Amino acid sequence: DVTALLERGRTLATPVLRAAVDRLAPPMDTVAAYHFGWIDAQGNPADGDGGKAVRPALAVLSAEVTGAAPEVGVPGAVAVELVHNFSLLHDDLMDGDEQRRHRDTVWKVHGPAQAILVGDALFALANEVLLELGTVEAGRATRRLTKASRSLIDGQAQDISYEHRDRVSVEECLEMEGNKTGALLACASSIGAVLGGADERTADTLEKYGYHLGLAFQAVDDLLGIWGDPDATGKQTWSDLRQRKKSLPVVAALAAGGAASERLGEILTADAKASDFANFSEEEFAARAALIEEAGGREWTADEARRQHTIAIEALDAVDMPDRVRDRFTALADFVVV
Amino acid sequence: DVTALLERGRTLATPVLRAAVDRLAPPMDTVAAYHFGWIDAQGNPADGDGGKAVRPALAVLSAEVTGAAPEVGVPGAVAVELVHNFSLLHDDLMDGDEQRRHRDTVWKVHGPAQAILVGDALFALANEVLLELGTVEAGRATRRLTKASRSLIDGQAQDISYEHRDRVSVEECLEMEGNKTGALLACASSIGAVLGGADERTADTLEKYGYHLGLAFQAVDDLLGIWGDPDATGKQTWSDLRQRKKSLPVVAALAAGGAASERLGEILTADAKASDFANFSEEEFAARAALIEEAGGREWTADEARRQHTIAIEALDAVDMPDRVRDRFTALADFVVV
């Protein structure tokens, strides 16, 4: 039933989102289609697009908490996906990332201007998709979307603010990751319910579930970014270390102290100015991973994942909810860890 | 009482907007402050910032239509100004404009990434400033903001879509200018009223007033962009022609036909590829202005301004409204033409 829910969310939300995207004024409809993988760089149809469906599955589930049909949360799932993709379009341009899922980013193919524009258009469309309903529930749901969107912007500001720092604290990484990943999962977890009429207290609680689920998810993402096998990830070995990310394992290792921690600090500071960084081998990236593990970085991040999972699942206990729905929310939380 | 209303809108909205902007996470608060002219390129305080105050004046006026206090429309005026400035930040980057009001643009000073980021932050803050209220009026007011924001994005898409075209039709220019200027004035004209409890029919009508006022405003802006005196505009002689804009006079002249129109077509097509465009003199820009006038471009645009003014002011007649407020709305409409 685990992959049944992810299927359920994808099949409900994708056609509604695709139809809303095709309605954008030219060239924004085609440029967005490229972003979403429906067409290629010269505008001919393509596939290899469908990523993960955690957020949509969550939003349709969120509606069932009040007893409403899954479809009631579909506007919520569409809006969340739209804001998500607005964030990607702009973040990729800001970060200078030429690639995402082994495909050229919109800014590389269609120019920076069109990446900014379509990004803006998706963010405005998300608010439209909710407010179109004209109801009080829809206004409150947009309020939740806005909080999450302001948060993602904050997380990106934090990212930019730390990009030249030789070290970032654990606390700084946590609040950044909460903004980046947690806030939108919190919104996805509570938006369907808000659309189904739930009061301000029921919703916040579901937000607390989603936020802490988000942190558990990002902690696991950080573990897989370094130690993940190419046959499961699709990415290169030690992919996050090739991009010099300061993920939780990296940061936790730096904050530790001791010979492993101290030496990793010297190396990562040296790596930032390193003229031959582009020549680095797998083994050199392995050495840095091995040092993060010795400093207790990996272990600390697995324990954080486990802790956050628990805080999430223990927040579900606090909300009055049909027990079939609670079971479904519980199973997504376990899927999030691997 | 004309400049009394513009003062009224500026003094009510500016401190509320400034306080909301200062609350943004670093570096977004300072980068926004630079955008707004409160600090200079090295972060020390500055002035020369306060531009025009038509939109805020309009939004506080809009609230009075229902009988509410001006202050009720202040969230509406702040949100409109925020969306406006999000639009500038992003449009300037997309257009590659290094300057605005004789000051370096944010992207030139602080980088493209921070222009995108602060732009996004202002757009998310605008929705927050309204939805914070938690009321049904506030949800409906955000709905109006969203329509206007989707429209400005559309207008910018149109701008990009026509940027290499040797000719643009009159109709294409009108719908672009309606998106660019009209939509947000429509929103400013109706948002205070929506915040004061007005029904869906009263609001649309005020929107029709604001939209057509916007077109009249942009037509006059287009006349001043070419024939405006440097002692009133602050800009160089024939400033819009130095930037090769396809404003309404330019476009109306091209659509005319006849020897003036045909020759202007050849010249503007030639000017686009011209290796020595940077060397063009005042007199050459005067010749092109003189040709637009001969083709009936100037006259047509003054008649459009007059027509749009009339459609706006005649839309005010359709709405039940205190006659002191109607008089105030009428006087702004006359100020818009010069």
**How would you write chain B as a 3-class SS string?**
CHHHHHHHHHHHHHHHHHHHHHCCCCCHHHHHHHHCCCECCCCCECCCCCCCCHHHHHHHHHHHCCCCCHHHHHHHHHHHHHHHHHHHHHHHHHHCCCEECCEECHHHHHCHHHHHHHHHHHHHHHHHHHHCCCCHHHHHHHHHHHHHHHHHHHHHHHHHHHCCCCCCCHHHHHHHHHHHHHHHHHHHHHHHHHHCCCCHHHHHHHHHHHHHHHHHHHHHHHHHHHHCCHHHHCCCCCHHHHCCCCCHHHHHHHHHCCHHHHHHHHHHHHHHCCCCHHHCCHHHHHHHHHHHHHCCHHHHHHHHHHHHHHHHHHHHCCCCCCHHHHHHHHHHHHHHCC
Supply φ then ψ for residue B164, to 5 degrees. Answer: -110, -5
> Which structure tokens are listed for B144?
């109006």
Q: How far is CA A139 from CA A122, B62, B71, B178, B188, in A?
A: 18, 21, 22, 27, 20
Select from A26, A139, A150 the Cβ nearest to the Cβ of B124: A150
- What does DSSP assign to residue A248? H
Coil vs helix vs strand at A273:
coil
Task: Write out the two tokens for B203.
Answer: 């609001």
Q: Please report residues of B whose CB lies closer than 8 A to that of A160.
A: 27, 113-114, 117
Expressed in angstroms, the distance from the first to the final Cα of chain B is 17
Q: Enumerate the β-bridge partners of residue A45.
A: A39
Q: How many Å apart are CA B177 and CA B216, to the nearest integer?
A: 10
Are A188 and A80 a contacting pair, CB within 8 Å? yes
Question: What whole-number distance in Å separates Cα of residue B336 and Cα of residue B36?
Answer: 23
Q: How far is CA B68 from CA B3, B64, B186, B247, in A?
A: 22, 5, 19, 39
Q: Is B29 exposed, middle or buried (0-12, 13-18, 19+ CB in 10 A)?
A: middle
Using only C-alpha atoms, what is the Rg of chain A? 20
Pick left, alpha or beta for residue A127 (phi over 0 → left; psi -120 to 50 → alpha; otherwise beta).
Answer: alpha
Q: Which of A120, A154, A158, A179 to mutate to test the interface with B (most CBs of B within 10 A)?
A: A120
In the chain, the amino acid numbered A256 is A
> Per the structure block, which two tokens stand in for B112?
């493209």
Q: Which method was it determined by? A: X-ray
**Domain at A1-338, CATH homologous superfamily:** Farnesyl Diphosphate Synthase (1.10.600.10)
CA atoms within 13 A on the CB side of B110: 27
Locate A202 and state its tokens: 């029921």
What lies within 8 Å, CB to CB, of A280 at 6+ separation is A242, A274
Q: Which residue has the tokens 């007199």?
A: B283
Quote the tokens at residue A239.
């992919």
Element (H, E) at A223: helix A200-227
Half-sphere exposure of B126 (CA within 13 A, CB side): 31
- Report the 10 Å Cβ neighbour count for B77: 33
Report the distance separating Cα A224 and Cα A163, nearest Å: 22
Spatial separation of the C-alpha atoms in residues A141 and A144, rounded to whole Å: 5
* Residue A147: other Cβ atoms inside 10 A: 17
Å from B333 to nearest chain A CA?
29
| Spatial CB neighbours of A3, under 8 Å, sequence gap ≥ 6 | none
- C-alpha angle with apex B296: B292 to B300, nearest 5 degrees? 110
Could you give the CA distance from residue A112 to residue A89 in angstroms, rounded to a whole number?
Answer: 10
Residues paired with residue B39 on neighbouring β-strands, in sequence order:
B45
User: Is the alpha carbon torsion for B49, B54, B59, B64 positive or negative?
Assistant: positive
What distance in Å separates the CA atoms of residue A192 and residue A83, rounded to the nearest whole number? 16
Rounded-to-integer distance, Cα A31 and Cα B315, Å: 38
Other C-beta atoms within 10 Å of A273: how many?
Answer: 8
Q: What pairs with residue B99 in β-bridges?
A: B104
Q: Alpha helices of A132-162 — where are they, by DSSP H? A: 136-162
DSSP 8-state code for residue A245: -
User: With left for phi above 0 and alpha for psi between -120 and 50, is residue A238 left, alpha or beta?
Assistant: left
Query: Which own/partner contact pairs does B39-47 have at CB distance under 8 Å and 24+ positions apart?
Result: B41/B104, B41/B109
**Which amino acid, residue B123?**
F
- Beta carbons within 8 Å of B326's beta carbon, 6+ residues apart: B316
Breaks in chain B, after residue numbers (C to N greater than 2.5 Å): none
Q: How many residues make up chain B in this entry?
A: 338
Q: Look up residue B300 and give its two tokens.
A: 């047509």
Q: Which residues of B touch A114 (CB under 8 A)?
A: 160
Q: Is B100 exposed, middle or buried (0-12, 13-18, 19+ CB in 10 A)?
A: middle
Strand partners, A39: A45
B interface with A, Cβ–Cβ < 8 A, is 25-28, 90, 93-95, 112-114, 116-117, 119-121, 123-125, 127-128, 131, 134, 136, 138-140, 142-143, 146-147, 149-150, 153-154, 156-158, 160-161
d(CA B209, CA B216): 11
Task: Answer whether B153's CB lies under 8 Å from B185's CB.
Answer: no
First CA to last CA distance, chain A:
17
| Residues forming beta bridges with residue B100, ordered by sequence position | B103
Q: Are the C-beta atoms of residues A253 and A296 closer than 8 Å to each other? A: yes
A21 neighbors A85 (Cβ within 8 angstroms): no
- Record: contact A25-B158, CB cut-off 8 A: yes
Q: Which residue type occupies B76?
A: G
Instruction: Tokens 């010099």: give the residue.
Output: A244
The span from the CA of B30 to the CA of B51, in Å, is 20
B164 Cβ contact list (under 8 Å, min separation 6):
none
Joined together, the tokens standing for residue B75 give 């969230």
**CB B247, CB B226: distance < 8 Å:** yes
What b/e string do you get for A295-308 counting C-beta neighbours within 10 Å, with b at 16 or more? Answer: bbbbebbeebbeeb
The sign of the torsion formed by the CA atoms of A210, A211, A215, A221 equals: positive
Whole-number Å distance between alpha carbons of A177 and B338: 53
- String of DSSP letters for A84-135: HHHHHHHHHHHHT--EETTEE-HHHHH-HHHHHHHHHHHHHHHHHHHHTT-S
- The structure tokens listed for B114 are 């921070």
CA dihedral A199, A203, A205, A210 (to 10 degrees): 170
Q: What is the DSSP letter of A73?
A: G
DSSP classification of residue A236 = P
Which residues of chain A are within 8 Å of residue B160 when distances are taken between CB atoms? 27, 113-114, 117
d(CA A248, CA A297): 7
d(C-alpha A34, C-alpha A53), whole Å: 19
**Is A116–B154 a contact, with Cβ atoms under 8 angstroms apart?**
no
| Residue with tokens 């007011």, as numbered in its chain | B141
**What is the C-alpha to C-alpha distance for residues A101 and A109, in angstroms, rounded to an integer?**
15
Contacts of A154 in chain B (CB under 8 A): 25
Query: Which of B89, B91, B92, B131 would you mutate first to test chain A, the one with the most A CBs within 10 A?
Result: B131
Taking CA atoms, what residue in A is nearest to B93? A113
DSSP secondary-structure letter at A71?
G
- Measuring CA to CA, how many Å separate A182 from each of A76, A83, A178, A298, A302? 16, 14, 4, 20, 17
Q: What is the DSSP string of A10-65?
A: HHHHHHHHHHHHHTSPTTHHHHHHHHTTSB-TTS-B--------HHHHHHHHHHHT
